[PDB]
Each structure stands twice: as C-alpha cells, then as structure tokens.
Design a protein around this ligand. Sequence first.
Ligand code: NA
Ligand code: NA
Ligand code: NA
Lengths: 482, 481, 482, 482
Amino acid sequence: QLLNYIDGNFVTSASSFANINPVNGKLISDVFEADAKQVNEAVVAAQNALKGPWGKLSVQDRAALIHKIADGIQARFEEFVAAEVADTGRPVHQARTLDIPRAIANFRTFADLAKTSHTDLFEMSTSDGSGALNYTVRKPLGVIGVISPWNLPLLLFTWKVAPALACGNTVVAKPSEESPSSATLLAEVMHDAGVPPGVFNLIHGFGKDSAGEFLTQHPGISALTFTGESKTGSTIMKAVADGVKEVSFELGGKNAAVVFADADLDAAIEGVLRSSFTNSGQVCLCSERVYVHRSIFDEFVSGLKVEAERLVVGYPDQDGVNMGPLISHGHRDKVLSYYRLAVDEGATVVTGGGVPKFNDERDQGAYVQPTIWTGLSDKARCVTEEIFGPVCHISPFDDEDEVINRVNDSNYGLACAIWTTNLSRAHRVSRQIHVGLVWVNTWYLRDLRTPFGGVKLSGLGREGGRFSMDFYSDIANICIKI
Amino acid sequence: LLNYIDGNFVTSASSFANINPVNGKLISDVFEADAKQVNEAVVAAQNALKGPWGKLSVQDRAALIHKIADGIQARFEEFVAAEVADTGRPVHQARTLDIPRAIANFRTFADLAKTSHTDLFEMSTSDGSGALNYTVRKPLGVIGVISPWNLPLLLFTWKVAPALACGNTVVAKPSEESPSSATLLAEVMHDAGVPPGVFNLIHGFGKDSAGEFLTQHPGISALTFTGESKTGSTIMKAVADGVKEVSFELGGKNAAVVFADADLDAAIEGVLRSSFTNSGQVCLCSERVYVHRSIFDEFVSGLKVEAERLVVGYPDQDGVNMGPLISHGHRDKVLSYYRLAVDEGATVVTGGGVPKFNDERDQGAYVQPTIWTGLSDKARCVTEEIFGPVCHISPFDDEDEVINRVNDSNYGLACAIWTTNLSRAHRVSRQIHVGLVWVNTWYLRDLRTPFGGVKLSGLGREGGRFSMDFYSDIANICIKI
Amino acid sequence: QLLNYIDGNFVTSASSFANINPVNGKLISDVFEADAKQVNEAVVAAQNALKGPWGKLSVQDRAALIHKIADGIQARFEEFVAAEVADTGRPVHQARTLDIPRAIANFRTFADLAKTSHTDLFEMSTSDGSGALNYTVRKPLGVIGVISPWNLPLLLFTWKVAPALACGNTVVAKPSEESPSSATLLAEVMHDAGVPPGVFNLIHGFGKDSAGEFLTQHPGISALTFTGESKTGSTIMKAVADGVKEVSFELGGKNAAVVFADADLDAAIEGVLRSSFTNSGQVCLCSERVYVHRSIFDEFVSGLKVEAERLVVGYPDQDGVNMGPLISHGHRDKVLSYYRLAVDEGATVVTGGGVPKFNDERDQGAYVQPTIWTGLSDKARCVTEEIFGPVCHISPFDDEDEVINRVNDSNYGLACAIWTTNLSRAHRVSRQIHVGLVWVNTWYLRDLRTPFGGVKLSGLGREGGRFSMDFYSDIANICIKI
Amino acid sequence: QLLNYIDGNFVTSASSFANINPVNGKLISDVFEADAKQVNEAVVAAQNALKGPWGKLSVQDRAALIHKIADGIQARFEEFVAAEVADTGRPVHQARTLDIPRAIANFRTFADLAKTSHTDLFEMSTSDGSGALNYTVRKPLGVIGVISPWNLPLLLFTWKVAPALACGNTVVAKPSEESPSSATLLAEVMHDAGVPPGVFNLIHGFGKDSAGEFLTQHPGISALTFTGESKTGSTIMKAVADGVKEVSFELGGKNAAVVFADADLDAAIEGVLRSSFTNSGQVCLCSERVYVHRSIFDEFVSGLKVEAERLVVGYPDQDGVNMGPLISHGHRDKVLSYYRLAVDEGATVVTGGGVPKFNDERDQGAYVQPTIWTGLSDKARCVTEEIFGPVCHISPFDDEDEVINRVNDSNYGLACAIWTTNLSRAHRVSRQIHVGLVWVNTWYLRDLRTPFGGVKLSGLGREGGRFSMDFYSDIANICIKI
Ligand code: NA
Ligand code: NA
Ligand code: NA
C-alpha cells in the first residue's frame, strides 16, 4: 500500500487504485487516490510551511538538509532501485546506473547551487547627482505544483522537486499513477530526514477529475512545472491562465538523429541503437526519426538491424537484458496501433513490428519488439507523431542543408543527435537545428548546469542550472535612491 | 494612419477613429488590419528571418538598431507631437520622459546585443576523454507584440527593441487609442533601411480583431503583452495549444508606504508623482497609500495642498501638470469608481469629479486628481485597479502590519517605501511581495534590471539579460570529444 | 615535534627552531627548518603530482576529496582548536567559533565552487560568413607557492590552499614560524584522506635565507600567493619578477572606523571595541584609527574606556576571557615601542598603555593591555603606521567630506567600518572610501563568495569567489573557425 | 614636429630624438623626449583630473565622450593611416583595414562595456537572524601608466587606453620611440573632443633613464600595463614593487603552428604564410615554430616556399604589396644576427635568409626577406628564442602527444595555431596546449570580449572583456548589516 504524505503525516484516502507490474501484469500495490479535499489540505499546509521553520532556514542550513535527503536515498539505494523496477519494468542495471544516481545527483546539484548562487548590483546616475542602487534578490516563488511523468519516475520527479526546495519553496507533487513507488519512498526519506511538515507533500492520483487537475486548478499554488505529453501541457496552460501562474513545460518530441557520411559508422549505429531503444524508447529524448547519408544508408540500416535483433528483451534482472516492457497495457495499445498504422502507410518493417512471444508470465505483461521502419515519406503520421515506443524510421539524404530542413520541418523541437567526425560540420550544423538540445557523437549526456528544454510544441521556458534557480524564484528588484 | 506590412504601407477594408482626448476632436482615421492581413504580416516576418536581416552580424544588427534610434532623434518633435495628440500628455513629459525613453530602449538593447555572450560547461565522461557543452542564443522567431495606450511609444519600443536586438522579426499591434507614434516608428524603420518583413505594424482592437488574430496565429513563436490581467489570461489560453512563449506585465494595485522616519516633504512630493503622473495611468502608480499614524494627518493635508496646486489643462499650457485621461470610455470607468468610492464610505479630501473649462476641453476626457481617506482594506476602491489619478490614504502603526497589508493583494507589480533608516529600508523592501521596490523615490528605471510582477501582475521578467533570454532560443550544444 | 611534509612523507631537517607558547613562554615543540634542497624537492614533487592521478581526477571527484579533507578536520576539530590556541594564545572561544570553522568552510566553499563554476562562449562573425566560436576554459595554473601569516594561522593558510587545490593545482606552502602547528596537523589530515603524494607539501622555516625565500625564488612555481606585511609583499614581487610569476597579495593596513552622529551609539562602541581589540588587535582588518563626530566624541570615548576596562585579559580557556597575549615576545617589543612613541608624540592615554600584572606564569608571556589614545594629529606616526596590537586612536571630525578625505589620506587601503543608521549615508559614504572592504554597522562579517583584497600598499589583486577561481587557474581562450 | 601632451597642452622638451621612416631611412619628424619633471607633471595632472569634471561624469556621459574620441579618429581616418604607415612601413591596405579600424573599435567596445557592465549582490544570514547584504562596485583604479609597443602602434596603444578611460581612470601613456606619430594624433583628437585636461597625457621617449622608467617609478600611478619583451616586463614588475602597483603584462612568445595530416592543406599553407609573415613577422602572435605531420611535411614546405616567394616586399602603396620593412635598422640587425645564427646552427635555408636588393631608396630602409628554415633541433636557439622577424622554422612530427610536448616545451606560452579537420582532435589537442590563446584553422581572429593574455614568461593577468573592466577598476565590497 502507497499512502499520501500531507503536512508531515502519511495518510490513506477513501478510494484506491491498482499499481500493476508491466513485466507480468500482477498487482504490486494499492495506491490511495488523494481527493480535492486532501489536495487543498496539501496546498494550505505548503503555504503555511513557508511561514514556519523552513522559511527561517539560512541558505546553508537549507542546502545541508537537502544533501541529507540525498544521503537518505543513498542509504536506501537498493530499495529505490527495487521500487522503480517494480513499477515500470526497467532493467535493474539502468535503474542502478541511470535513474537512482541521477535522482540523488539532482538534489546534490541544486543544494550546491543554492549555496553558490548570487544576484546583481546595478549603479545608476540621477538628475540630482546623488545616484541610485538597484540590487536584485531571489526569494521563494511560493508553493510549487509538480506533475511528473512515468518514464523516468524518480529522475524527472526530483528534477523538479530538487530546485523547488533548493529555492526555498514548498511543494505539492503528484507522481504518475503508473509509477508511484519511488516517490512514496522519497516522502519517507523526507520524513526521516526531518523535513518540516508541509514543506514536501505527496498526492497520488490521475489527471482529469483527479489529484492532477485539482492541483492545477488550486489558487494557492504559485507555479506549475510539468513534464509529459504536449497536449497536456496545453491543457495545464489553459487551466492556470486565470491565475497567471508561472509555468515550465518539457513536452513531446519527434527527435531526429542525423548520420553524415563522415560519421564513425559503428559508433553511430551503436548510438542510434541507444537513442531509439533505451528505456524501450520511452524517453522524451529518444530518436524516432533517423536520417542517414545515402552513401552509407544500406550499410547503416543493416548494421542497426543486426544490433537491434541482438537486444535482449526480458526480465529486469535477466542476464544480459537490454529492454523491458512498456509502462502499461494501455500504452502498449497505443504503440501497437502506430505499429499497424506504419504498415498501412507503406512502411517496410526492417525488424520488430509486433510483440515478442514469451510463453511465460511475460505474455500477460506489456512488451513490444524494438522496431525499425524504412520507406515512409516525411508527411507520414508515423514519421511526424510521437509514438513513445522503441521505434525508429530511417530515411536517406544527400545534402547537408536538405537534412537540416527535414529535421526542422516539425511542430516539435526537443532534441537532436548528430554523428560526424568533421570539426566544422559539427558546429555549423548543430547551431542550425531548431531544438533545445543537440548532441554530437553521443546522446543523452547530461551536465546538470546546462539549460534544458525545447522549442515549439516541445515546451517553453528552460530549467537546469541558473535557469531553474530563476524559474523557482521570485526575482525582485530593489531600487534605492541615495 | 496605415498598417506597415512586408515593407509597404497599406490600407484596410475598415477604418476607426482616433480621437484627441483634450477636446474630443478627430485626429485621424486608422485602417484596421483583418485576419488575412495579420497572416500576411506573420508570413512575411517568418520569411524575413531567412533574408538579409537573418544574415546580419550582431555588430551590423546593433548598428542598424542604433540607426532606428538616430531616426527617432532626428524627428524628435514629430514624435512628441504624435504622442501628445493621441493621449493629451503634457508636452514637457512627452519631451523628457516618453520620447527619450523610447530612443534609449533601442540603444540599450542594441548595446546588449553586442556585449551578450553565453556559457561553456566542461564535463568528464566514462571513457575519460570528456565532453563540452556550450550554449548559444538564437532568434526565437516571430514576436507578436500587443502593447498599451498609457505610454504608447515607450512601452511599444520596450518590447520591440529587445525583439529586434535578439534578431527576431516583429508583428506589432499598438493600442487603438494611441496608434500615432507607432506609425511614425514604422516610417523611421522604413527610411532607416530595415529589410521588409522585419517590422510589421498592424492596427486594430483585441477580440475578433488584429490583436486576437495575432495571438491565434500559429506562425508566431512568442507573444509579449503589457496590459490588463484579465486580457493576459485570455492571451495565455489563446496561445496554449501552440505552447507559445509568453511574457506578461499586467495590472497592479500598487502601494506607497511612508514611515514615521521619512523625509516628509520628499514623501509628499513622491506620492504626489506616483499617484497623479500621466494622470495616474501608469501601471506603476500608487493607488493605495499607507502612512504612519503619527504623521498621517499632516501628510494628508500636505498632499491635499500640493494636489490642489496641480495644473490640469492643455498639453502645451504654461505650468501644466496633468492632461486628460486617454478616452471618454475610460473616464466613464474612472468616474464610476469615483461614485463607488463615496457609496463605500470614503471621505473625499480633494477632487472626486471633473474640472470645468468652458471651452473645448469640456468635450475632452478630464477628471480631477482625487484623494480618499476612511475606506477599509476590503473596499473595492482600495482593492481594484482604477488607472486614474487617484489614491486612498490609510494610517498604519506597525511594520509587520503594513507589510502584511501591502501584500494582502492578488496583484504585485511595484511598491514605494519612504524611510530614512538603513536597516528599515532593506529589511522591509525584501518582504514586499512585488517585482519592483523603490525606496525614497518612484519609477526610477535602469533598463538592465529585471522588471516584472508576481501573482496577477505578471509572468516572467524583461529588462537587461532577461529580455535577451526571453527574446531568444537558448540552445545547448553538447560535443562528445 | 613538527616535521615538513614532502612528496607523501614527513621528514626532518638539519636545523630546527622553537615554537613558544605566548601565554607563558614555555616550549610547545621543535620545528624542522626546510633547506633549499628540500624546497626544491617539494616543488619538483608538486610538478610531477600534476601529471599523476591528481591530474586525472574529474572536477567532481576532486571536489569530493576536498570535502573529505574538510571532514577529516571536522573529525579532529578539538585537536585543531588545541593546536591554534597553543601556538598563538587566542581564546578557545574564538578558535572554536571563528578560526577552525572557517578553515573547514574554506575547503567546502571552494570545493563547491569547483563543481558549479563554468566559463564563457563568444560567437563572432567572419568575412567568409561561416563564423567562429571562442570558448574559454579554466585549467590548473601549476604549482602554487603559499606563504602565510601567524595572525589567523589555519584560517588564512586554508584560505589559499583550498582554492589552489579546488582549481587542480598542487601546493608548496610555508606556514608562519610563529604558528606552525595547525598546518602540520592539516598535512596529517591530507595524508589520511589519501591526497596523492606531491599534491600538498608543507615546508617550515622563516623568510630571508630560509624556506620562504627559497620558495619565492624557485623557477618551478607558477604563482606566489602571500598574506602579510607590505614590505614583504614588495620583496616577493621583486623575487618572482624574472619568472613573471602570477602574484596575489593581501597586505597590511591602517584601518579606520567612522562613527557618525546618527549612529546607534552603544552598538558603535561595542563594534569598535571588537574591531580594535579582537585577536588582540592582530587582524589585518582591525581598526587602529577612529573618527567620531564632534557632537558625540566625548560620550564615545568615555563609553569605550569603560568597555575596554571590562575586557578580561588572560588564559585562552579562562571564563569570559576576551584577550590572550600577543603572538610573541618579539612582537610585544615592537608594540610597546609604539606605546612609548605615542606618549612621546603627545598622546593622552585614555586607558591601557602598558602590560598587565598577573602575579603568575602569565607574567612570562607576551601580554599587553588594550589601549586607547586621543589628541594626536593625523600625521603622527602612531596614527599612520600599522602597529598590529590592541590599540586605537580616536579623533573628532565635523564634516562628512572631511572625514572621507581623512580616512582616504593613507598609503594603505584594506578595510573600513562605518556606523550610521542613515540609509543614504551608508551607501553614499561607503562607495567613496578608498579600500577593498567596507562594513556598515558591523565588522569582519565574511561571505566567502565576495571579492577580498585591498588598494594601494594594502595589496594586489582580489581573492574570494570567482576571483579565487580565476587567480588559481589558467584562463585559456580557444577559437574555432567554422 | 611631435610634442608631448600634458595637462591639456602640447609642450616641447629640452631634448629631441629622430623619428625615421624604415622604408628609406629618411627623417619623418623630431620627437621631444619627456624628462623626469614633465613625467611628474603628467602624473600629478592625471591625479587632479580624477577630482575634476571627468571624475563627475556619469558612466553614460563618459561612454558618450569615448565614442566621440572614436568618432574623431574616424573623421581623420586617412591621417591616422598615413601616420601609421610612415613610422612603420606597414602596407597602406593593412593599416586601412586592420590597424585603424581596430583602434577605433577598441574605444567603441569598451565605451559600450562601461555602460553595460554591472556587479554582484550577495545575501547572507547572520547569528542575530536579520542578515546582511554584500554588494560590489567598480571604481576607477586611479592613474594608469601605459607603455606600448612599436609593432601595432595605434592598435595596442588604444587597446590599453580605451579600457583605462572606459573605467574612469586617467592616463599617462608613453608610446614607443619607434612609432610616436599616431599616438600624437590621438592626443589632438582628445583635445578636439574636449576630453578634460589631465585625463589623457602623452609623454615621449625611451625606457631606461627616460620617460619609460620615470613613469614606471612614479608613486602616483595606480597601475602599469605594458606590452612588449619579457625582460622589460620583469624590470617593470621590480620597479613598481615598492609601490605594490597593479600590473598587467602581455610579453613575448615563441608561438607554434601545428598542422595535422587531416588539415585542409592549402588552407594551412595560406594560414601559416599569414601567421609567419604578416606585419613582417613583427606580431607577438606570429608563428616562428611550425610542426607538420611527416606525411605532408615535404608537400607543406614546398607549398609554403612558393607562396612565400610570391610575396611582394616593398612600398606601402606599391601595387600588390604584402610586406614592408622591419621597424628599424636596429631591429634589422638583431633579425639578421639570428639569420646567421640559424646558418651557424645548421639550418637549411628553404628561402630568404638575407635582405632583398631593391637598387633604390629602399636599400637604405630596413627590409629583410621572408625566410623559412628546416633541419634545426628543438634545442637550437633559433627555434627557442623570439626573433620577431618574418621567419619560421618547420619541423616534422609523428605523434599527437609528441607534438603537444614539443609545443609546450617553452619558457613562453602566448599563442598556438592548430590545423585539423577532425572534431575530437581539435578540442582534445587545443585544451592541452599551454598558452593563453589557441586558434583552430585560423590565426589572429580577435573578439574583443575574450580574455587575452599569456602564461609563463609570456605574461601576467588577462585583458579583454570584463577582464579589462576588472583590471582597470578598483573592485570594492560593501557589507551592510541589516
Ligand atoms: Na522567477
Ligand atoms: Na528564450
Ligand atoms: Na581591479
């Protein structure tokens, strides 16, 4: 059983929902859904905590307490690994090396920035010759509403909660209904670490007519930060508009990888394998479109096919497992529906295209095969809409400007990876991709000080580094006439 | 007054009247852009990004922007006249605040465009060869600009200057009530050699007009707006499906606070200005005033005196201090607050009506500078934004009390504090829940500072680097070595 | 006994010298003086250490190790308190709440800054229209020679060593002969924490024709950072000139305090008492000149007399001890010589002027009385020369511009404290004072992110925050034509 | 015809010295050498101008006035060209497109940074719980002493004078005896722009026992910034040592170009031709050492020989002129003394090696030939000592780690140019070169915002961008207790 955490107490709710293990379809736990009344209690508790001990902590004391939260996750490391794996079916090795360490690192990085961050001093002259001073300060924005996704549950959850707390805000967070275990554990770490009641609040539930909608509509929040589907971003923006709430969105992507004729071909095959199928292609940053220079296109597709078919699709702790299932049955229905749509649009299915057959309990889970399509036009729905499964379409190109234009011809703009060994090409091309993040000869390498976010439908605002310290703060200007 | 689109001055199939509010006389007809014309503006701005404007170095861009500035300086007095006519502002203030600030907007952001740089982050990797992350600023794209009538050219250019400085193209809809200086600006840009499609001026209104069409148009990348909060919320919903970047500077109900240890004459002068400047039609004006009990009556009587000394009349009159409100429709809204004040229990210390001229001005849109006392913190006249030359004055006793009373608001743009005490100034300033605090002064602006509000008073910050960030895509480029 | 620490090993020397407890003149330990050959050994080992594991550490791992050093000092907190107190006589109170906590915070602040710090990206246009990028990086400068003072032994020692290590340098450091203990213990902490051999080297000795000089002359160093007497600063600057070594100097001052008529009078009396007599007036930052507006002058002098006479002078762990002895008998000779000079120049001795009579072992120590002078002119030697003991002279003033000129009419310019409750005056007056550091209504309040340094004879350069990160690094610009 | 400019007046002197045209050895003008007394008068007047209307300008007005200076140079553009060409023999085209535009840009860039630069606000907590603010401000350092070189007279002179004035200092500036004309014209432009008297002072003369040394010894300056030979940098550091004056040094170098096998070969030949022979190899950034991968070595050398022999050495207005003379006969004697040393050391002379025969007035000037050597060892003097003439030695190399070691095996480290088309190599190699400036696939591309300086004997400190705004300012911390 997974309880809510409100004003320093773990509390049940009236109704509950099932958390299902996508590996086998079995029940992991029951999760009490916070109702509107409990959400209001969380918000009000969070407002009030801003006037309690939390509000009086020095930036050094606040940061030391956040490092302690992080020590707590570390001390329960394997429990956190086990929770993420149960909920989502992610390979244990990924949970051990990507997800939980990044969740620890999020807290440490922003606790550090809390200590080092400063503001600005501007001098000016005036008519009377005595001058003025303008200095700025950072204050907590207020209560931050976090609605976070199921694909990187603890990582993306802490990505928001860490800078929010580092900036002195209080929090009411709603983790995905598909993945609530690690967040529920984080609350326990919060509690045991002595985080004052009301600072961090955890409400479980869904979106519409549930905890997520209640949060989004509550007038006592000062901001809503959200990662997830683009149409949901749009819904959230409409919902907080009457309140003119500060908003921060990381949304969909139809991300491209580009492979030039001078790429290290083996490294690019391996890189596109990772960018297409990591977390079974359920990363916002995954490459679902791939452009490859004509002269190496056949060799690239053949190489990637071989490598994709070597992927081990199986149990999270199975020997050399690469790929787990999708998050849920309902998500798999959506993915398989694009699988059929691609055949109908005229794709050649280079590999995959269906669901593997296990002849064991995994057949009741939510697996699909890693899939490569070829032969679709740039207009096809499967080349333009985010699928959020382990798939990519590969298309040839001849000319640099042509491929830049094809990558950019999109209502999204989150990320792009480019493969080339040429110094000029790397820099010339990357600056021309209309996205928030480019990688050259790698993918999803993250320095947490960098600005991160997207253009067009992929989001608005930036987080990371000082961008987060600014978003989760009131920036106030104080002008002294001397 | 014509629209300016893709390098050409063009008419529309419908015009509206621009009325001089000093005397009710028609100044000019203004062609209203239709949906088809707004689309034409946006499409041309989009195309302008791939033309000569797009290929200018940052140094040549800034030079051209400095040339726009020079262009305005060269026609300074036509600009003063245009702004006066539209709005009735004192000729002196147009001449030393409005027009100079608009020129400084262009110059400051041109200068920032040349000095701004971005970031390099080094990192280690597993294989031990490392990686580099660097950031770049790029044009965001087409900037939709919808701007207010109270400081027409100043607030128009406050947005347009950073948009252009960051290499964007612009589709700008100035207020229906003050379309003249913008139209001149378009002439300056045309004569200065700004490439076609880079700057586009479209005239009209909000709902079912140019403004609405702009905000609904999918070709823009951002919408920056200064105005009413409710209009802000409307825009946010309209751009939500395209998840457009937004920047809002919205209403306030701003307070001025006078502590017992203030320089009382300076404070009286200060609040006089903060209350009645531009006939109280700055979003930054003080419509609430808290004065320490020990000095409350002396402050009110002094403010009464100085307020009654203000000269209300012609923009060019000898010692004029105030002009009219922007329009009859706005005077109607303001006179309706004047009545609501009485009906709410207010003591009228001064004004509370219109003045009498017995000449054309009676056809104008004047109201008197007004002071109220005796209302409660929950009176509507003390909570809601009026945007006229009026303030209510209320006593206070304690520091924590007045802080709480200032912050007890759904708005939070600005606040002025009067005190001679060092500790008090810094202690109290930091606790006011607004974007902008002034101590011992008001509306003193350094264009590098973050400017914006909290709560209903806005979203985001503009000014200095905050503008340079808002009006650009920040992109991260990560090179594995 | 106290050894040098060279290339991973404690070692003795030919010569040794005594370390004397200034409370009672008794021997604490023998200290081995490093010779030229062993200084050469230290520099060469530091050079090679740059090419060993130390140099392969990530910024993250380097920072973690520097936090381990800080941990290792926290774990021996009281031993470090004991060692500082023994060498110098400072009250145990001050060692526990200022000295040792700073040494520790020095390492932690600079380790944090190493993790958060980044550099710059400048794009530019070029003729051919393809453009160029300039990006800068921070690299280790090389071997940093550190020569440090006895007045704040571990605090000022670590103030240099911490940023030097945080920036990836290696270090050869010479603590003061008068206070070698806390540094030798620090060497132990480094050894125990696994600091690779050669990264940190400790050499004992004196200046001329001893370790200090040898260090400054050695061609193998990249920089010389020094805190102390101005003339010594000049001497070091000449000695490194042939090698054009980077230099950073925090030198002396004759710091003033200004009390304006609208000051909080009791607060100003307390603050000037603290800025004149803290550490027995042996801080670079103490106020030896004081200017008080005429209207409150007599009342200020009377009040300070009373408070200075309530000061407890005695043992480091005595009840509410306020002052210990001076660092040494030799230093007391110099200070008393000044006490006589002040009388000779026609000063009224308001209080003090001598040494107290203990009638116990403290009579064998190096104590003097807190002293206050009036009636000297601005040109008197005792008003213009740094005495570095617990004394201040007080003079009246009438005008603001007048007292600004009087404070500024000095060949030094480290620090100044001003007392006033007036908003305008604090900002108007502070910006006109020709020094590196001004305090308003307080003194020696340190934020370790701020630039610290002086003007004129009081120094060269700035340290603290980014200024330390720039000083202890090569800043390199890399320009890529695209 | 060349007078000093002191406290607002052009004044002559007791002695005069001749300014000779290096194209033909003919007298251009006589220059009045400043004596110790005039040097004192210049400093004293600079100190007073700080207290005058100059000191009171807002930053906006001071910047407005620096732009006027720029405008005034621009209105007399061709006279500045004539003056530069006359003193130095520089090709008119280069004077007209590099030297004078850069001189004007220096002023515009720093006037602009004066208006945009701001400082820092640090908040901090305190024991009593009400906290404190620290903020910084930039103020004029004071009187800046400028001593500038003959190789880029107006460019390097204004590179120091622009930021000095932009930060509100006053200046006493001693231009090179070899090239005093353009600085004297600047003085006229200053006068005519209405720069208040004493703000800018021009003194002419030599170094030791002349205006150079006297400026350097005056206690009245706050800083001395100098570009030129390293030994003269050392001498300077010693002379201001008793003063602890701020110092900023851009000294010599023995800069390398490195060409890897994957370079665009024709681009690298053109690039090394420029880096070797521009301004007749009298730029401190010139490459006198070149390392070329053995596989392209013969082809590179053979290609560079051809391009070198296509260089037109002659008159500044000669139809296709590429190179003018060296700066003086005195300089030519040194360079020819190296051309012989090279032969005596065993060099093969690929081309040049002597002086060309014009059979006209040019034979009385100071020309040498563009020269290329091979065959020397890395320890040869001609490969290790700065010649400062139009020459380079070319050596082959095999390994990347090897060429990096050979490049870095130098007491200097000013700049390096690398040629490669490989992305990783470019970034991997550049960061390992121990210099202040690396160019990749170009040379002497300058963005004035970037830090500019050297390591080891090549310099001290950084200039450019905020590094200039920081060096030419007092940085002051003001700490307000609340
Ligand atoms: Na913010
Ligand atoms: Na942006
Ligand atoms: Na400085």
